Structure formats: structure tokens, C-alpha cells
Design a protein around this nucleic acid. Structure first.
Lengths: 114, 52, 152, 54
RNA sequence: AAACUUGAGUGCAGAAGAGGAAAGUGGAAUUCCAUGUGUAGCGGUGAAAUGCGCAGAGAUAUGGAGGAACACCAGUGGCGAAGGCGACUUUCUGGUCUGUAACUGACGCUGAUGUGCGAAAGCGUGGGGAUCAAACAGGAUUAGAUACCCUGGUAGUCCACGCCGUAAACGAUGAGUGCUAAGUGUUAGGGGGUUUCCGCCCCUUAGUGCUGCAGCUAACGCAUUAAGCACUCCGCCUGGGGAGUA
């Protein structure tokens, strides 16, 4: 359990969310932008990803899982600023993947916004 | 899905920023933010082809 | 002409006593209502008490006191509408010099004593010892521009 | 000639670096080659000789 | 009453195609459920709130069920009379184009009345119901709302069978056949010429675009895909409202 894991981020258009887990995903720790006193619409900032990443990573503490090999799963503004701020914790980011859900034209998306 | 090692993190990003821009992820989900009408994408693709 | 380009900034004349440009710029800002002599006499009697309450000569003490006044980040408002509209922007070196002189005088005028014989020199030794009232609003700018750091 | 859907090696230089199709704009093939290709690349996606995404 | 072969049609030989219909197969995503692990928010906006969560939410991982569509290829590309048609496979079936000239010998064109197809939204009888979503409910905005925005949501959206027969159903241009500068992309062939170690060049046929003379137009513009020059036939107009109404 020590120094082996998968880091999941999915920054949407709001509220960059990060959950770090082991290599066979079991949700070791997680944090958000709402868990740092960002109430609303400040969460869609790269500066919100500057603190939300390591405050789940450094407050994991159960096994010393200190490698991540992060996974990106969202179109957001704080996308690459959550892995740049992950080496502020310094956890040897070794395999970056953009695993985002892309449909094969499957379902009907919602209405246009006037 | 590309592994980048034997370097820093500020150079693996430079690989990853252009390994996403040369992919149908960001231009695909920006297209499907809202349902467009089934005859206005045929003109949207026509404007994105006549300009090339 | 502030839209043809930039205005050509002009030269000043340094002080005869301290041999310093920074002293004369302090003379011009404490010069209330064009009175050169009646304000310069007060500055020439507001660094003797500096040199009385500290053995060092005041030309060292002046440029040591203003470094606890001069901030490194400030707020310039950009018209973004519904956003925060408060961008933390660093300070150009000309405004870096001026805005320290501004806070040093504007809070020297709000003390208990009436004479600027010792209204000025008390706040200088406070700024020399990194305390007082003109220092504590630099930290107020460094708790405002450094709180909204999402616009670097 | 005609593209057979088992001949993977000549057929996987046309697949993308994730599993997509390169257009003939960037590959440089002709018109009728590209659509005789695409009915063979998609029978090879169905029998797991090539993925849909990697 | 005969004779002819160009028009028209059948042969023979090649092609190209999201042309239809029926039955199978497949993957990503959405939603819901079950479970593991795990902890305070998630969601949403110009800002918030309604809503959801401590009866474990979201996030993450595996598995399941179900409905709907078919990313990339994908292009001022292809096919069809139009509406239209986009995963893949098989069966059944329609049309066009090219080339050869064997054959039939004007068999042609247009077409009132008639008879059939005809997007969506509708309606009927049943199914199915995942997303989306009129009506409807609630929260914000505003000067004000029944609008815009947000949460939720029914008919519908989907299938089968009968209807309905209307659209800015538009190239706002009926069909057929000739004739009249050129230049240029591209699609489906054919004959050449080198040869290419499969790639060009020239000529021609049928599509599909963009430029542009003559000519035409009231002007914009159109211009071998005419709105040019002709001939045939059909539909239709003759001031605006009243009215596509009694």
C-alpha cells in the first residue's frame, strides 16, 4: 500500500475535484475546492487547484502512497494547474493520462443556452 | 495515455499539452456542450471546411 | 499626452544637506500650499530627533524606514464586470518610490502631538522599527492583494 | 487492389495514435482508397484486431 | 404501304454508392440499480438559491439492466424523383454512369382527371420509456413577467400498424431536347502517352462546385448545372387589403 496509487482529477467548468486512490481504485483520500472555503464561482480557477491537490495528497497519511501517475477526466480551467501543484507536494508524477469520457455520438445533449 | 519520465514535471506537461491538442477531446466536448440543430452543424462543418 | 504615448518625466534637484534626491521629494510632499521654507524647516527639525533617538545619521535611517513602507503588490482594477475586478499587480519602481513617501506623510498627520517637529519623526522611527501606522497598512495591502491571488 | 481486413500491419499505419482514423488530408491517399479502407478498418475493430480507443 | 439509324430501349463487359426493406452483431457514452473502498459537501450561475447528501451523496473501481444514437473516417463529397439517407454483417431489391457495338426499329416527349410517395409536429390502437423536453412546479434576475437563466418534470421524442398530407417542402427557378468564349477544383469511369517501381501528363464521358465573355436583366445578378438563343407540353399570375377568410 506504500508508494503505489492512481490520482484522479476531473476539473469541470466548476469545482475542480481530486480523489487519490491506490492502483486498484479504492479512494484513499479526496478533497475539493468547496472543502477549502471556496463557496461558489471561485472554484473555477487554477488557483483553486493550487491548494486542492496537495490537501488530499498530503492528508492521505494512511499508507504513505507517495507516487500518483495522475489521470485527467475533465475539461476545466484548472486542469494542468492541478498537476503542476502536485509537485508542490512532490509525489513523482510519472504517467499523465487524459482519460475523459468522449461519446461515439450516443445520447442527446441538452438544449442550447440563450 | 503517454508515459513521460526521466525529466521534470514542467517538461512532461509540454508533451501532454500537445498530446491533448492533437486529439478529439477538448474540441469534441466543447462541441457537445449543448445540442445543436441537425441542419446547423452541416453549415458549421461547412464553415469549418471552406475556411480550411 | 497620455494617449499619444507616455509623458516625458522630468528631473529633480537633490538636497544640499543629506545630498539626496529622496529628501527633496519628501520636502515637496510635505509642502502644504506651496510654502517651501516653512515645510523644509520642519523636516530639518524632524530628523534631528531621529538622530537624537538613534545614534545613526538619518540618511541611513530614512531609506531604512521607507523599506517597511513600500509594498511589493497592489491592486489595479480591471473592468471585467461580474468578476472580482481586482487584479494583484506588482509595483513599477517609480510608483514604488512615490507610494512609500505618500503613506509616510499621510499617517504622520494623524498622531497625538500637534507639531510636525515630532509628528513626522515618531512615525519614521516606527517605520525604522517596522511598526506604527504607516507600516500596518502595507500589511493591510498585503492581506488584501495577497488574499485575492486568483488573478496573478 | 483491395484492402483485406486481416492485413493488420498496412491497416494500422492508418489508425491514429489513440485508435481514431487519420483523414486522407493528412495521410494523402485517394478518394476510393479511403472509403475502401474505412469498411475494412471497421470490420477489424469488430473482431478486435484493432481497438476503438487505446 | 415500305426503308433507315442517331432518339428511345434491350444485350454483352466493367464500375461507384449514408438508395430502400427485414433480420442479426458490436463498442464508447448517458441514466438507474446492486456492491467494495472512502468523507463532507455535490450541483449550478453574471452572482446565488431551489434541488441532492451523514438512512453514506458526489468522486473512484468492478459487475448488471435498459433505452437511444452511431465519435474518428466526414469533404462546397456520394446516392435518391422529392421528403431524405451516416456503426457493422448477411439476405431480398430499385436506379444511375462508363465502354463495346450484337440486336429491336420512332417503340418518343409532355401529361389535365386520376393514382401513389411525402420532414417535423400531431391523432388512433398497443408497446417501450435512456437522454432530451412543450405544458406544469419551484428558486433567482428585472423597473416589471407568463420571457431569458437554474433545479425538477408529463405528453412527446423511439418501435409496430393504420391515419393526417401540410413546411422558407427553397436552386424562393416545371419537365424534355438541341445549340452558344474560356479558366479552374473535385467525384465515378474509359482510351492514350510516357512509364511510375501504382506517380503524373494530355483527350473524352457523366456528376458536382467556384470564377468569367457574348447575350440577358428593372437592378442585383445569371452565365454549357442560364435567369443566353430556340421548339413542344403542363402548372400558374394579372393592383393592395378584405382572405387562403364566408
Amino acid at each position: 500500500n506504500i508508494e503505489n496509487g492512481v490520482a484522479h482529477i476531473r476539473s469541470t467548468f466548476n469545482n475542480t475535484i481530486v480523489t487519490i486512490t491506490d492502483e486498484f481504485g479504492n479512494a484513499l483520500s479526496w478533497s475539493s475546492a468547496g472543502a477549502l472555503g471556496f463557496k461558489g464561482s471561485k472554484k473555477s480557477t487554477p488557483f483553486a487547484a493550487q491548494m486542492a491537490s496537495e490537501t488530499a495528497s498530503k492528508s492521505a497519511m494512511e499508507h504513505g502512497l507517495k507516487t500518483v501517475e495522475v489521470t485527467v477526466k475533465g475539461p476545466g480551467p484548472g486542469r494542468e494547474s492541478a498537476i503542476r501543484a502536485l509537485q508542490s507536494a512532490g509525489l513523482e508524477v510519472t504517467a499523465i493520462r487524459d482519460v475523459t469520457p468522449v461519446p461515439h455520438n450516443g445520447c442527446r445533449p441538452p438544449k442550447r443556452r440563450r | 495515455t503517454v508515459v513521460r519520465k526521466n525529466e521534470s514535471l514542467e517538461d512532461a506537461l509540454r508533451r501532454f499539452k500537445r498530446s491533448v491538442s492533437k486529439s478529439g477531446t477538448i474540441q469534441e466536448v466543447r462541441k457537445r456542450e449543448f445540442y445543436e440543430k441537425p441542419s446547423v452543424k452541416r453549415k458549421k462543418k461547412s464553415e469549418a471546411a471552406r475556411k480550411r | 499626452m497620455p494617449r499619444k504615448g507616455s509623458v516625458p518625466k522630468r528631473d529633480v534637484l537633490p538636497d544640499p544637506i543629506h545630498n539626496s534626491k529622496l529628501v527633496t521629494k519628501l520636502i515637496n510632499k510635505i509642502m502644504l500650499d506651496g510654502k517651501r521654507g516653512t515645510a523644509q524647516r520642519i523636516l530639518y527639525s524632524a530628523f534631528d530627533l531621529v538622530e537624537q533617538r538613534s545614534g545613526r545619521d538619518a540618511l541611513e535611517v530614512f531609506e531604512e524606514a521607507i523599506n517597511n513602507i513600500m509594498p511589493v503588490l497592489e491592486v489595479k482594477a480591471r473592468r471585467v464586470g461580474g468578476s472580482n475586478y481586482q487584479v494583484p499587480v506588482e509595483v513599477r519602481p517609480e510608483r514604488r518610490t512615490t507610494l512609500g513617501l505618500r503613506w509616510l506623510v499621510n499617517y504622520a498627520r494623524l498622531r497625538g502631538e500637534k507639531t510636525m517637529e515630532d509628528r513626522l519623526a515618531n512615525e519614521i522611527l516606527d517605520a525604522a522599527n517596522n511598526t506604527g501606522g504607516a507600516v500596518k497598512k502595507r500589511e493591510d495591502t498585503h492581506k488584501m492583494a495577497e488574499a485575492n491571488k486568483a488573478f496573478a | 487492389t483491395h484492402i483485406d481486413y486481416k492485413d493488420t500491419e498496412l491497416l494500422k499505419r492508418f489508425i491514429s495514435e489513440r485508435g481514431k482514423i487519420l483523414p486522407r488530408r493528412v495521410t494523402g491517399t485517394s478518394a476510393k482508397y479511403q472509403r475502401m479502407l474505412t469498411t475494412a478498418i471497421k470490420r477489424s475493430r469488430h473482431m478486435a484486431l484493432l481497438p476503438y480507443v487505446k
